Amino acid sequence: ATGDEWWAKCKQVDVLDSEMSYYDSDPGKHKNTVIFLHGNPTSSYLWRNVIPHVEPLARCLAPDLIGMGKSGKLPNHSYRFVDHYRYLSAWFDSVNLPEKVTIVCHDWGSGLGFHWCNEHRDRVKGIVHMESVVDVIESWDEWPDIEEDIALIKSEAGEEMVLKKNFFIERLLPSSIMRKLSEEEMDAYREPFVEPGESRRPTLTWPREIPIKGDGPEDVIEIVKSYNKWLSTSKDIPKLFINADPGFFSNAIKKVTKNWPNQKTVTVKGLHFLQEDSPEEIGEAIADFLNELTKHHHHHH
Ligand SMILES: O=C(Cc1ccc(O)cc1)Nc1ncc(-c2ccc(O)cc2)nc1Cc1ccccc1
Hints:
It contains eleven helices and eight strands. An eight-stranded mixed β-sheet has the order 1-2-4-3-5-6-7-8, with helices on both faces. Helix 2 packs across helix 3 and helix 3 packs across helix 9. Ligand CEI binds next to strand 6, helix 4 and helix 8.
């Protein structure tokens, strides 16, 4: 599936001063509805082999975050978490969502989705999350050891690595898929970032936002602390954690969420970009989760 083939099935809608591209399986159809949120450095294309398993059960939306995929670029090249939330938040209001939705999310898309859910709790049918931002990083012994890499990316070498050498696309992304991407799959991911310079800025700002205790930005830390607190006691919100084996953040997520009520776990084969190694098994687990939702079980503990 080429990039042009994927985006040919996608829509665009104005958002604030810009526009966002997005996949919509059933525009205008008020039914069971699932929103898929990608992360860094991917796009809605990441969900292309997952959505077909969910589409029979739900209208599927998968937006391109601002500055990414086929969505607009911001002329000031500010793509902090709050910048992204601004546009995603407005996007939610513009695609005719029913009263409650299910969020499926990955990486920084789970940061944005968790926060959106925290701020619209009455609209959350359920949350599927994987390789997700579930808490502030307080110890590098509980987490993958990227301390030195984050420091490196925060320095001036970050601009060279990403703006000029597109590090996240050309090295990080394929390093954390187990299979080898086809070269039309790789071009799909290169496509939004082919012009060197500031078009790649979103893939540099995103790791610069990572919520590290005593090193991460206070606004992202407060947002994460506050949706982590909410999720930790969200007994009324059904949740699926898709664990990637061996994964990247998966092991740290496994233990950060031990205490969370009403969360089931399913493990699949994968590193960070698990959707490219087990698309079908991720798709089936979502369909199972969605079939169980409709039973609206009254859980005891
Ligand atoms: O900052 C993030 C977002 C994030 C996701 C989950 C989570 O629990 C906390 C934060 N991710 C990130 N941020 C920075 C880096 C990173 C940067 C440089 C480097 O040499 C290695 C990893 N990696 C990553 C994730 C990643 C992506 C692809 C492959 C491996 C790992």
